[PDB]
C-alpha cells in the first residue's frame, strides 16, 4: 500500500474500528461503509478521514506516529503526519485537542526523537529520566526512561512494572511515548500543584503537575 | 442495653442496611435477622456485630466517631470506640483496614480532637488540595479548616456514599503523606468506602470518592 493511516488506537478511541481501505482496522464491504462509521482515506457520510493534506476548515493536523500500509513510522517533531477530518451525515465536525503517540512503542525505538527532547528530558529529570528512591523506582514515565522492561505495549499510556535488579521495583507505573516537550504548556501553573484534563491519542487522561518538580499521567 | 453503633455509613459501605436493635439503621423484625445480613450488638449468622469490647481475635478495633442509641459522640483519639466483628455463615471473617470519620460533622463541631491534630494543621496548613471527581478537581478541606464556612449543611458532602469536607483525625493520614518517591497514589478506605489518595512528597494530596 501507499495508503496513510494513524496508529489504529487514535481512530478506535474516537469510535471507529472498521475500514474498507486501511489494513490496521477490521475490514468491511464498501457498500456498508456508506451506512456505518469507518476510518478511510476516502470520504463517507459517517467517517474519520485520514489524508496527507488538509481537506476542510475543521481538519485536525496531527504531528504523530503514523503508518503507510503495514509499515509504522515515528513522528517528526513539529511536522504534520496526517490530517484527520470527522464526517457525520456528510458534515465535518470539529475534533478535540489531544497529544499523540510518536510510534516509538510499536517500532520499539527507545531513542530521543530530536535533540530538544534530550535537553527537555535532562531539564525535567524527575519526570523523564527515572530515578531510584530507596526500594522504589520513580519517574520512569517515557519510553526513553531508565528502569523499564524489554517490551512495552503500544497504548496511549502503558502501565508496566519498572525495576533495577536487586535494589528496587515499581509496579504499574504509567509510561508514554509522546514527544516529551509537548507537555511544556502544562508545566507552569498559577497554583503549585495542578491537575489538567488532557487526551493522548484521544483517550481521556489526567495530567498531574507539581511545578518545577514532576508530572505524570492517568486514564 | 448499650446500643453502641458506628456512624451508620460505616456499616452501609460495608453492605449492611437493616438492624433489629440499632436505631441508626432500617428496622427489621428480630425473627428475620437470623436470615438476612444485619448490623447489631447481638450475633446472627450473617451480620456486622458492634460491641464495646472485643468478641474474638478477628474483631476490628475502631477509633472513630460513634453512637450510643440516638446520641452521637466524637472520636477520642488513641481509644477504641467500638469493636467490629463480621460474621458470615456463622464464622467471623477479617475486616479491611480503613480510616474513620470523627463524628464532628453530625455534632456541629469544628474543633481539633487534641493538640496533636492542632499541631498537624499548623505544620501542614494546606495539605488537602482538593477532591478528584472524574477529570474535574473540586474543593476540599478538613472540618477544622479556617477556609470553610461556619455553616456546613448537608449541601456540602462528607467522605461517604448514600465543598467536600473530610471529617477525619488528620494525623491518621501521616503514613501516606511521607512517600519515598516524589508522587504516589495510595488505595485506602474512609469509613470502608474505597478511595484513592494521590500524594505529592511535600505532604499534600488529593482525595478520590
Would you write up a description of this structure?
Two copies of one chain form a homodimer. Chain A is mainly beta. The first copy, chain A, folds into two domains: 97 residues, no CATH class; 122 residues, no CATH class. In chain A, strands 4, 5, 6, 9 and 10 form a five-stranded mixed β-sheet that branches. A three-stranded antiparallel β-sheet of chain A has the order 1-7-8. In chain A, strands 15-16-17 form a three-stranded antiparallel β-sheet. In chain A, strand 16 and strand 17 form a beta hairpin. The longest helix of chain A is centred in the middle third of the chain and has 9 residues. The first copy, chain A, starts with a strand and ends with a strand. Chain A: It comes from Equine arteritis virus (strain Bucyrus). Chain A: It catalyses: uridylyl-uridylyl-ribonucleotide-RNA = a 3'-end uridylyl-2',3'-cyclophospho-uridine-RNA + a 5'-end dephospho-ribonucleoside-RNA. Chain A: This is Uridylate-specific endoribonuclease nsp11.
Jot down its keywords:
mainly beta; homodimer; 13% helix; 5 helices; 219 residues; 17 strands; five-stranded mixed sheet; three-stranded antiparallel sheet; Uridylate-specific endoribonuclease nsp11 (chain B)
Give a quick summary of the entry.
The PDB classes it as hydrolase. By secondary structure, chain A is mainly beta. Helices cover 13% and strands 35% of the residues of chain A.
Amino acid at each position: 500500500s501507499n495508503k496513510i493511516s494513524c496508529l489504529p488506537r487514535v481512530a478506535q478511541n474516537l469510535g471507529y474500528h472498521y475500514s474498507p481501505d486501511l489494513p490496521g482496522f477490521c475490514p468491511i464491504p464498501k457498500e456498508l461503509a456508506e451506512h456505518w462509521p469507518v476510518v478511510s482515506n476516502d470520504r463517507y457520510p459517517n467517517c474519520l478521514q485520514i489524508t496527507l493534506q488538509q481537506v476542510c476548515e475543521l481538519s485536525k493536523p496531527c504531528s504523530a506516529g503514523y503508518m503507510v500500509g503495514q509499515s509504522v513510522f515515528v513522528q517528526t517533531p513539529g511536522v504534520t503526519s496526517y490530517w484527520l477530518t470527522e464526517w457525520v451525515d456528510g458534515k465535518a465536525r470539529a475534533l478535540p485537542d489531544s497529544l499523540f503517540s510518536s510510534g516509538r512503542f510499536e517500532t520499539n525505538s527507545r531513542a530521543f526523537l530530536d535533540e530538544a527532547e534530550e535537553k527537555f528530558a535532562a531539564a525535567h529529570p524527575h519526570a523523564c529520566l527515572g530515578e531510584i528512591n530507596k526500594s522504589t523506582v520513580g519517574g520512569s514515565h517515557f519510553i526513553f526512561s531508565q528502569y523499564l522492561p524489554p517490551l512495552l505495549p503500544a497504548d496511549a499510556v502503558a502501565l508496566v512494572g519498572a525495576s533495577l535488579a536487586g535494589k528496587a521495583a515499581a509496579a504499574a507505573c504509567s509510561v508514554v511515548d509522546v514527544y516529551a516537550p509537548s507537555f511544556e504548556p502544562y508545566l507552569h501553573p498559577e497554583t503549585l500543584s495542578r491537575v489538567y484534563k488532557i487526551m493522548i491519542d484521544f483517550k481521556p487522561c489526567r495530567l498531574m503537575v507539581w511545578r518545577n518538580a514532576t508530572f505524570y499521567v492517568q486514564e
